Amino acid sequence: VPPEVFDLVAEDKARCMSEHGTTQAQIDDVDKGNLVNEPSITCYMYCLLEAFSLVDDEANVDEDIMLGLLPDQLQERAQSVMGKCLPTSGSDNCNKIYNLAKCVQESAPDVWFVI
C-alpha cells in the first residue's frame, strides 16, 4: 500500500493555527502582505517561524537559518533587510514578530516572502 503522504508545511501551519485560535482568513491576509498587531495572528507567525527554527523561544532570529531559506542570488538583499530589522524587539514574542514583519515589509516593499 502506498505510504500516507504528509505535507509538512500544511501540518505546521495547522498546528500553529490551532494553538492560537487563528483563522484561515487571517493567514490569507498575511499571505497578501496585510499585517495587523493582533495576537491571534501575530502569535501564529511567531509559532510558524519557531517551528522552522528561524527564531528561538524569545523570538530572536537565527540569521543563518533565515538567510538559508533564500536562493544565493537574494543573499545580499536579505542581509541588508536583516541589518535594518534585527535584532527583534517588542513587548512579547508575538509583538516582536509583528514588528519584524512590518520592518521586512517596509524595507523591501516590492516583494513579500511566505512559507
Binding site for its own copies (CB under 8 A): 1-9, 11-12, 15, 31-34, 50-53, 64-65, 68-72, 74, 105, 108-115
Q: Which residues contact 107 (CB under 8 A, 6 or more apart)?
A: 80, 81, 84, 85
The nearer residue to its own copies, 54 or 94, going by C-beta atoms, is: 54
Binding-site partner at residue 45 among ligand NBB, Mg ion, its own copies, none, CB < 5 to 8 Å by type: ligand NBB
Q: Which position has the grid cell 530589522?
A: 85
CB 66 within 8 A of CB 54: yes
- In the numeric block, which cell numbers belong to residue 5? 503522504
The three cell numbers of residue 46 are: 511567531
Binding site for ligand NBB (CB under 6 A): 8, 30, 45, 48-49, 52, 54, 66, 69-70, 74, 77-78, 81-82, 100-101, 104, 108, 111, 113-115
